Scaffold this active site. Structure first.
Site, PDB file in Angstrom:
ATOM      1  N   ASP A 178       0.838  -1.203   0.000  1.00  0.00           N
ATOM      2  CA  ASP A 178       0.000   0.000   0.000  1.00  0.00           C
ATOM      3  C   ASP A 178       0.883   1.267   0.000  1.00  0.00           C
ATOM      4  O   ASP A 178       0.561   2.238  -0.684  1.00  0.00           O
ATOM      5  CB  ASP A 178      -0.979  -0.004   1.204  1.00  0.00           C
ATOM      6  CG  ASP A 178      -2.263  -0.795   0.968  1.00  0.00           C
ATOM      7  OD1 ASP A 178      -2.440  -1.338  -0.150  1.00  0.00           O
ATOM      8  OD2 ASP A 178      -3.107  -0.845   1.885  1.00  0.00           O
ATOM      9  N   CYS A 212      -2.513  -0.085 -13.274  1.00  0.00           N
ATOM     10  CA  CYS A 212      -2.500  -0.066 -11.807  1.00  0.00           C
ATOM     11  C   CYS A 212      -3.656   0.910 -11.339  1.00  0.00           C
ATOM     12  O   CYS A 212      -4.629   1.074 -12.068  1.00  0.00           O
ATOM     13  CB  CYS A 212      -1.126   0.322 -11.242  1.00  0.00           C
ATOM     14  SG  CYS A 212      -1.165   0.887  -9.509  1.00  0.00           S
ATOM     15  N   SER A 213      -3.567   1.457 -10.101  1.00  0.00           N
ATOM     16  CA  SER A 213      -4.361   2.469  -9.422  1.00  0.00           C
ATOM     17  C   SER A 213      -3.911   3.844  -9.942  1.00  0.00           C
ATOM     18  O   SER A 213      -2.739   4.058 -10.274  1.00  0.00           O
ATOM     19  CB  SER A 213      -4.072   2.446  -7.923  1.00  0.00           C
ATOM     20  OG  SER A 213      -3.947   1.152  -7.366  1.00  0.00           O
ATOM     21  N   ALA A 214      -4.829   4.785  -9.937  1.00  0.00           N
ATOM     22  CA  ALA A 214      -4.636   6.151 -10.412  1.00  0.00           C
ATOM     23  C   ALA A 214      -3.477   6.934  -9.788  1.00  0.00           C
ATOM     24  O   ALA A 214      -3.352   7.000  -8.562  1.00  0.00           O
ATOM     25  CB  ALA A 214      -5.924   6.933 -10.220  1.00  0.00           C
ATOM     26  N   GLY A 215      -2.673   7.543 -10.656  1.00  0.00           N
ATOM     27  CA  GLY A 215      -1.575   8.441 -10.314  1.00  0.00           C
ATOM     28  C   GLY A 215      -0.424   7.945  -9.464  1.00  0.00           C
ATOM     29  O   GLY A 215       0.384   8.770  -9.021  1.00  0.00           O
ATOM     30  N   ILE A 216      -0.311   6.622  -9.222  1.00  0.00           N
ATOM     31  CA  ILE A 216       0.771   6.123  -8.369  1.00  0.00           C
ATOM     32  C   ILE A 216       1.749   5.169  -9.084  1.00  0.00           C
ATOM     33  O   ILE A 216       2.363   4.331  -8.439  1.00  0.00           O
ATOM     34  CB  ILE A 216       0.243   5.510  -7.059  1.00  0.00           C
ATOM     35  CG1 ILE A 216      -0.667   4.288  -7.327  1.00  0.00           C
ATOM     36  CG2 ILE A 216      -0.453   6.574  -6.184  1.00  0.00           C
ATOM     37  CD1 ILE A 216      -1.061   3.557  -6.031  1.00  0.00           C
ATOM     38  N   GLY A 217       1.900   5.325 -10.390  1.00  0.00           N
ATOM     39  CA  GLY A 217       2.845   4.548 -11.188  1.00  0.00           C
ATOM     40  C   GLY A 217       2.614   3.052 -11.248  1.00  0.00           C
ATOM     41  O   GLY A 217       1.492   2.596 -11.497  1.00  0.00           O
ATOM     42  N   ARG A 218       3.707   2.284 -11.051  1.00  0.00           N
ATOM     43  CA  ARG A 218       3.796   0.823 -11.064  1.00  0.00           C
ATOM     44  C   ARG A 218       3.908   0.225 -12.479  1.00  0.00           C
ATOM     45  O   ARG A 218       4.854  -0.511 -12.749  1.00  0.00           O
ATOM     46  CB  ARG A 218       2.670   0.157 -10.264  1.00  0.00           C
ATOM     47  CG  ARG A 218       2.698   0.483  -8.775  1.00  0.00           C
ATOM     48  CD  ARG A 218       1.686  -0.393  -8.043  1.00  0.00           C
ATOM     49  NE  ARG A 218       1.326   0.168  -6.742  1.00  0.00           N
ATOM     50  CZ  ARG A 218       0.355  -0.299  -5.961  1.00  0.00           C
ATOM     51  NH1 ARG A 218      -0.370  -1.341  -6.343  1.00  0.00           N
ATOM     52  NH2 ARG A 218       0.105   0.273  -4.789  1.00  0.00           N
ATOM     53  N   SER A 219       2.953   0.540 -13.370  1.00  0.00           N
ATOM     54  CA  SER A 219       2.878   0.098 -14.769  1.00  0.00           C
ATOM     55  C   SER A 219       4.155   0.415 -15.516  1.00  0.00           C
ATOM     56  O   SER A 219       4.670  -0.445 -16.248  1.00  0.00           O
ATOM     57  CB  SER A 219       1.723   0.790 -15.479  1.00  0.00           C
ATOM     58  OG  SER A 219       0.491   0.355 -14.953  1.00  0.00           O
ATOM     59  N   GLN A 259       6.304   7.262 -10.920  1.00  0.00           N
ATOM     60  CA  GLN A 259       5.736   8.407 -10.222  1.00  0.00           C
ATOM     61  C   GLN A 259       6.509   8.889  -9.016  1.00  0.00           C
ATOM     62  O   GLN A 259       6.192   9.960  -8.506  1.00  0.00           O
ATOM     63  CB  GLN A 259       4.288   8.110  -9.826  1.00  0.00           C
ATOM     64  CG  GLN A 259       3.319   8.417 -10.951  1.00  0.00           C
ATOM     65  CD  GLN A 259       3.179   9.905 -11.202  1.00  0.00           C
ATOM     66  OE1 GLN A 259       3.882  10.502 -12.035  1.00  0.00           O
ATOM     67  NE2 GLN A 259       2.256  10.537 -10.489  1.00  0.00           N
TER      68      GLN A 259
END
Ligand code: WOV
Ligand code: MG
Length: 278
Positions: A178, A212-219, A259
């Site tokens: 998280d 992934c989830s909005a605005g938090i990178g990962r992809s 991000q």
């Protein structure tokens, strides 16, 4: 390796990251900003550039928040998109169908930090299929392989108009924390190798769809590590592969890839460790 140690010792991750962010290209996203597309964009999510956006093959509205990242030298393509919204699941699967994708890569859990990060866009039980009336698609869970760090699902996508079916593989990394990044890139690398081993990233198929989830990178970390590792295998001089240069090249196709400075450091670690394994 040497560049990683020099940045780590001098505490320059934030500075290197800020320089990449400041040099990152800025292209128009006029279609994304049209009033009729307001409910197709996830809040706190980036917008796709007009030049690289994926178009839905629909006469009324062709918009989906998704971008095509085409890596010329590596011969790899990826579609990066937002986590589907309750009203864009039909569009998401229409894109998978039209782009002839074999794999979908999901790098978040549906709920993180007690909040919903994307719609439950795939069926959880074999006998309870999903129907997307707006795009005339049916989606069925065929099988599921639950592992400690990720889950793989075999899904069957049916174009209800023609009754043609396609098998789609859903690669779901379920253990990204998280907060921050994973402590070791080992499980993320094993996850990338599992995606590679399926044929989902190969040129015989359409581009893999990653989100992934909005605005938090990962992809971005997933694509950047995959392309860097492939270039290290292809080049006569693997040490000429500059991850910052690869990242800037990817950023020409979609904004916000990587991000945080922690994700940049994590991407370097995944590439260095992955190259040692390969
Ligand atoms: C073999 C199997 C059973 C259930 C699934 C989902 N599978 C897979 C099917 C294709 C694939 O590339 C990976 C897997 C896996 O679980 O490793
Ligand atoms: Mg059952």
């Amino acid at each position: 390796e040497k560049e990683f140690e020099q940045i780590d010792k001098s505490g320059s991750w934030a500075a290197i990251y800020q320089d990449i962010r400041h040099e990152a290209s800025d292209f128009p996203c006029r279609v994304a900003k049209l009033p009729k597309n307001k409910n197709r964009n996830r809040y706190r999510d980036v917008s796709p550039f007009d030049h690289s956006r994926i178009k839905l093959h629909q006469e009324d509205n062709d918009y989906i928040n998704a971008s095509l990242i085409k890596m010329e030298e590596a011969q790899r393509s990826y579609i990066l998109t937002q986590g589907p919204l309750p009203n864009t699941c039909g569009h998401f699967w229409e894109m998978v169908w039209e782009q002839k994708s074999r794999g979908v890569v999901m790098l978040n859990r549906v709920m993180e930090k007690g909040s919903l990060k994307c719609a439950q866009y795939w069926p959880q039980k074999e006998e309870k299929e999903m129907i997307f009336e707006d795009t005339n698609l049916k989606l069925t869970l065929i099988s599921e392989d639950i592992k400690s760090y990720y889950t793989v699902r075999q899904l069957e996508l049916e174009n209800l108009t023609t009754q043609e079916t396609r098998e789609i593989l859903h690669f779901h990394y379920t253990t990204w924390p998280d907060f921050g990044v994973p402590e070791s890139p080992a499980s993320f690398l094993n996850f990338l190798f599992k995606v590679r081993e399926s044929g989902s990233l190969s040129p015989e198929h359409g581009p893999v769809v990653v989100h992934c989830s909005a605005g938090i990178g990962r992809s971005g970390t997933f694509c950047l590590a995959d392309t860097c590792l492939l270039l290290m295998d292809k080049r006569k001089d693997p040490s000429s592969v500059d991850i910052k240069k690869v990242l800037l090249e990817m950023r020409k196709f979609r904004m916000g890839l990587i991000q945080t400075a922690d994700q940049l450091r994590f991407s370097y670690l995944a590439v260095i460790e992955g190259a040692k394994f390969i």
